Amino acid sequence: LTLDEAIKTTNRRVNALENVVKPRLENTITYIKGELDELEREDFFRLKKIQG
Amino acid sequence: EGTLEVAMEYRTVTGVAGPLVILDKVKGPKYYEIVNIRLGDGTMRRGQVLEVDGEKAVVQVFEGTSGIDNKFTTVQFTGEVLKTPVSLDMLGRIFNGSGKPIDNGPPILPEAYLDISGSSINPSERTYPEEMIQTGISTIDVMNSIARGQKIPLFSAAGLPHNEIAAQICRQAGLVKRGEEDNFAIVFAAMGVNMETAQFFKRDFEENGSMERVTLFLNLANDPTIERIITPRIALTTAEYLAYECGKHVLVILTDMSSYADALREVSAAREEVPGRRGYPGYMYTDLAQIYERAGRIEGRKGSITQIPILTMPNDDITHPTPDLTGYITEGQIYIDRQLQNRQIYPPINVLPSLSRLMKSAIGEGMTRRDHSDVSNQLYANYAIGKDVQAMKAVVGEEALSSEDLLYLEFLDKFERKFVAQGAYDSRNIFQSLDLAWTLLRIFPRELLHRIPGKTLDQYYSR
Amino acid sequence: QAWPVRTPRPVSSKLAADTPLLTGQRVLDALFPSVLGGTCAIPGAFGCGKTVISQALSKYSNSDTVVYVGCGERGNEMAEVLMDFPQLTMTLPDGREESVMKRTTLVANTSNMPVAAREASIYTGITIAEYFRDMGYNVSMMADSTSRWAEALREISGRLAEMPADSGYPAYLAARLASFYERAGKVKCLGGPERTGSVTIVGAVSPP
Amino acid sequence: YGYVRKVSGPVVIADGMNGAAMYELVRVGHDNLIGEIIRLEGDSATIQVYEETAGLMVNDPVLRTHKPLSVELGPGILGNIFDGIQRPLKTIAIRSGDVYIPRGVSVPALDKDTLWEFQPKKIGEGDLLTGGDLYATVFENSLMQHHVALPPDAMGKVTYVAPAGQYSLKDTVLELEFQGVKKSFTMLQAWPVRTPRPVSSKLAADTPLLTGQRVLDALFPSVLGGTCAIPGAFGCGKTVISQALSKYSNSDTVVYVGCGERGNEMAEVLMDFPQLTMTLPDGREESVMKRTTLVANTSNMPVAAREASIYTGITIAEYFRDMGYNVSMMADSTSRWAEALREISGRLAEMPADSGYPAYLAARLASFYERAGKVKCLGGPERTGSVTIVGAVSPPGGDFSDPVTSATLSIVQVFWGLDKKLAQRKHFPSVNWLISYSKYSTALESFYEQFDPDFINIRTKAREVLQREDDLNEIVQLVGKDALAEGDKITLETAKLLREDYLAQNAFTPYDKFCPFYKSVWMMRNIIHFYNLANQAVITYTLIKHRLGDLFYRLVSQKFEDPAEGEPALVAKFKKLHEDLTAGFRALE
Q: What's a single GO MF annotation on this record (chain D)?
């Protein structure tokens, strides 16, 4: 019984929890770098264009 | 007729930066006028005038700005937008990215010069696709079928056999036959393909003997990145001439649409335009529309343009901007799974994300069977339940599959084993495959089936 | 008549809407109802083909008139609409048999059509519905892919080199979209008799 | 003629250059600082100077070169050491005496005063010749004969042929006239790095790259003129494979290209190559440097030179292939090259793309990699060479998701996949069989069957055994070896024997330093045939295991045999061992 419970918990952690978190980390990385960093350069580039 | 004029040759080139060549003192420029630039060395390359302001002109050269001298290069303004000399004789030949004949053959004698990026069809005159297609592969035809005029791409990550699938479809392409002059003529765009893939395409097409009805627009990765953007335009313009202006149905194929997306990204980053998601241009939706949104059937003409693009998820992610916008525009998806490839299945078509938004009209009584829709819906829906059962078995154990869940698991196993798999040259007919599809649906009890009514399949009979 | 396309049609006094929109769908009219005069919005991410709900609502709504003004949508949907609305039919309380195409107009421009015309599409649609409302009817619309009229905004803001606000969209995007959506609602019209027509904005926003 | 006007860090603006051309290299200042032209706005130019621009003076002269970034080819290209911008490090060190690289060195790429033995072909003084014709060959050194190809984009009837003798590059070895005008050609050819070398036809690769390692030769073969990828960051596997390629590979030449790596690492590798020596099949002993060229650009080198080193190396490889030699390039760190490109893009303020790399990174990597392949030569006499790239990759933390890694995996046909886990487990080959693949096996099958029609079937069976190895792995993991059947136990034992006896090499040991394809094929046959013959007998696994001890020892020793006995003796021994194993498996059944 104890081994069954522990194996269920371990399998759930391996399959559900970690594979739930890692996409969340990837989406958070993409949202910050893929958008905010790109916008910051674009904003500054447009400002430099205005100055020129 | 209005008297002709020789194009003015300028030498006032007064600035080069990136891929953009600046000019000054231009006398009466024209937007998107094609200009061929002759360098001081004498070599010539083409280019378009992107922005026209005052008497200036910001030209985007094609073969690259390298070798352009601000006091020895000459630019000639033809005064006309880019035009592809389409002709009926163009069939059975191979052309470069811009259209240079590369089959050691004489150039095209144009029946009519036609401008690329032709105007849209008045949607009042637009009609609806109403006929199925016999490509020669079972799983695409049986479920998420393709209509004669329907656009639908292939989603397949890098390294997958999607090129082989495209070649097999093109070689085995044909009408349902339920005629040869109007039979499928295939325009085969090739944006950013490898040299080995190019030789493979040429040899495979020459081997099937259907060179008489197939046109190759090859554009290697060695060719300039901007020249890849005009390859789909030229291919679709030639397809438009063949279909609407000559009659024969055209099955347009474009490989590596992700390469076209990369070309768009490079060109946009060159001019420093407003970036959408993942740094792609903010107008990529409109460009992918102007590429894709030409498949269809026009009312007054008997032609039909069927579109079968081939995308490639970069990180094997459906959320990437290119496949996402495509799925927004492309009216359906035929999906290819790497996981099924790991199981050594030659046509790794995963049917769970694959749906044809026009299948509801391709099916009917004129073709197929009256139980097509319900059987397709069941083999589409029970796969998800089988996947859920597999996940539950993985996270709990083999004992979790009850008298009902184990049935779903067996359904999934047999569905992945027999139904999806097919021969590398097997032309599996619909009814012979639909019998096995019915058997797969009948693995589950004939009363637990919720969505399908029993009578629909009961009209059909086994053996 | 004639009317500026950006200036809203004048009215007597807007008033609260208290009549449900009988869409004929279980989910739309049972759990998450909509009122005849309210504003809706369907995200419908890629691959969902949200326009099926749009077409069903236009076919089977209790609204007297429908203005399907799909902007940036695929032409095949417009072909489907033009092909099926006449051959499809509905019945009225008088007992006669008639088509739904007798009351549906399309101001739609496809995605391959020029970009700048999309804002004009949206505004012409809303003004035509406003006119049909001032007639007194319970007119409604549904603008397919209003998010395309944000690509239309930014593809112009880029040429003007306006300062990007968020993801490239200009700053006034929310302001303009509110100015569009805020034209719905039941209202006593101008002049007698006491018409009390409404208008419904069932928008569709496609997210990346 | 030409003076600077604005010097803002690397960027330099020079007036009075109306005739300048885009991407034309230029000499800046008295110190002869070298930089490339970027924008030609107005009558002025714009130059980014590679070396540090500190100390430039306004109105200091700027001297044009009328040539893009180019490399001077010809005799003496082999053996030496060159920087990213084609600067001979050895001769610079000798001339300047000191160790530091002078800021503004002007030493020519190859010594134009040294003498080389020259002899023309049988061509006549009034014959006709065209671009790519091989009119002479030169003994640059022993056993590395150098053909002298008439440069492309040059043709005409022969006017003068230099008779055989001692000559230098400054001598006018050839003169000819196409039209009434006549041109005289020396032994030095200049070619821009960006422009590829002219080709007649891109052939289909039809000969494997015998690296001398069994795992690469048989499990995941690579073909001449084919791309290759290595995830090399630790374990010295990149050094091991580079040494194997230099010493035993079929290539007649090797061109190592190192960009932007650790300086001491390049010191170690550039001191390792001279120590490396290879014996000739004729029994002669040579030095690998006599056929090796090295282009090393450390991190201290200017970023533009770091980006240009790869193109310099690939152009050198193409020039070598122009005379039909089989040459292999080795990009030390493509990740460093991509980082250098990123730094250059950031300098140019180009719009950032995915993960910060410029949007053309994938396109430029594909353009570079597309130059590899077996190609028919240009001009007569008829011959064919090849250029194969074995450029490695350094993914961050091993995550094959960075754009460099993704593009490389999308372009490269064959990926060998060194694994740090095997290195931790003391694996000399360190090649992970679970991730490596060879997409060129379908094209190579012609030669594979011509050599041995059963070899391809053996390879397929070995792939199936490897696939079942992990299956048996989790089988033992979950229930143990007890639940394995006799056939399953035999399959597991054979997979373990293959992994620990043939799929792994011993490198350092003299007997397993080089693995001939003959020995590899016989070992694979003696393993797979024995595996089957034991398999169909299911017989108790314990009984056959007890009675196959001699057969197991023979199978293990089938790789312990040194190549001294040669192919005829080792093949006979392996055949006898296989026959004995078959007899023992069949008679005892």
A: proton-transporting ATPase activity, rotational mechanism
